[PDB]
């Protein structure tokens, strides 16, 4: 029930692309429904930095590292059912590739 070092490595390696392309507008309700984040934490995500969607995304992927070993699949699914297809596919692909690359 704790996120792997590889997943953290992934969330940091693609920090730029995530912060660039994450859409957090339709994401909240699903994030709460899928039980990925607690309401307190989401409340803090929305208020991180300047309210800029950018830094909201930043704090989101930062707080994602403290949500267990099932955080990335659940998050990617949240991306999927909010119409963020390409981002989902990118994360999924890079993640699986990362898993396969390490013996």
């Amino acid at each position: 029930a704790s996120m792997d070092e590889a997943d953290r490595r992934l969330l940091r390696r693609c920090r730029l692309r995530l912060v660039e392309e994450l859409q957090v507008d339709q994401l909240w309700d699903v994030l709460l429904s899928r039980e990925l984040f607690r309401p307190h934490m989401i409340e803090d995500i929305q208020r991180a930095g300047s309210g800029s969607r950018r830094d909201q995304a930043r704090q989101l992927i930062i707080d994602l590292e403290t949500r267990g070993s099932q955080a990335l699949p659940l998050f990617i699914s949240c991306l999927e059912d909010t119409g963020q297809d390409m981002l989902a596919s990118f994360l999924r692909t890079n993640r699986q590739a990362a898993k396969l690359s390490k013996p």
């Binding site: 390696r13 693609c14 920090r15 730029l16 912060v19 930095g49 930062i62």
Partner: protein, 94 residues
């Protein structure tokens, strides 16, 4: 980190401290890997911009050569062309 790498950093620490925006730089430095969420948190928690810059630089000094390179590349990617050029003549080859 190195001889004239860090010496070049101290040579122009004022301009760097009073110009750069750590928010934009630390993203690149994270994505490259030469920075951590803990250090990023340590830098993000400062009242003013120049203090964030100063903290970030303090952390850079303790790090190594490839970190200097990534810092340069961040500055260049973010449009700090003047400062990047001012940092160019300080890149090691180690």
């Amino acid at each position: 980190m190195d001889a004239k790498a860090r010496n070049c950093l101290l040579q122009h620490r004022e301009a760097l401290e009073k110009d750069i925006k750590t928010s934009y730089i630390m993203d690149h430095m994270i994505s490259d890997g030469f920075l951590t969420i803990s250090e990023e948190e340590k830098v993000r928690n400062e009242p003013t911009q120049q203090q964030r810059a100063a903290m970030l630089i303090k952390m850079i000094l303790k790090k190594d050569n490839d970190s200097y390179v990534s810092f340069y590349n961040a500055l260049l990617h973010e449009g700090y062309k003047d400062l990047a050029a001012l940092l160019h003549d300080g890149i090691p080859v180690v």
